[PDB]
Amino acid sequence: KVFGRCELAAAMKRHGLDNYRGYSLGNWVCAAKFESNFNTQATNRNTDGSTDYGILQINSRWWCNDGRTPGSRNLCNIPCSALLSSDITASVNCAKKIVSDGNGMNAWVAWRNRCKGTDVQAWIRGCRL
Ligand SMILES: [Cl-]
Ligand SMILES: [Cl-]
Ligand code: NA
Numbered sequence: 001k002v003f004g005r006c007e008l009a010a011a012m013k014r015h016g017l018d019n020y021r022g023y024s025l026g027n028w029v030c031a032a033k034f035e036s037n038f039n040t041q042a043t044n045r046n047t048d049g050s051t052d053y054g055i056l057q058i059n060s061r062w063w064c065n066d067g068r069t070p071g072s073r074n075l076c077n078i079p080c081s082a083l084l085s086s087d088i089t090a091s092v093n094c095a096k097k098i099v100s101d102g103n104g105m106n107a108w109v110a111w112r113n114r115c116k117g118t119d120v121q122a123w124i125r126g127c128r129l
Helices: 005-014 025-036 080-084 089-099 109-114 120-124
Strands: 043-045 051-053
Touching: 005 025, 005 120, 025 109, 025 120, 051 080, 080 089
Parallel strands: none
Antiparallel strands: 043 051
């Protein structure tokens, strides 16, 4: 599924991401835009052989099991394929664990490089939430 921008904003809000750990909704939409272009089926292979999955590009090195990242952890206790569903619940629940691990949203490179310090509000403007 390729979400529309307001459609994704509303789904994230329903799932408790608005102001989660002090990050307003537009941060999460911005991060999703640049990580996956709002596509739940996005995958990308990293240099270390890990892979990033789903709309928030969550890494198999630490967060999910894909059976092909030797020595990896599965901190979200999920198969990585679950991160690719049209239902974003599993991605949101796992992202909540990531952003709480001390490093906030800096875990997402695209957020750090393309969202942090910008007017993220603009990612939710015009949306009925
Ligand atoms: Cl915002
Ligand atoms: Cl980047
Ligand atoms: Na893993």
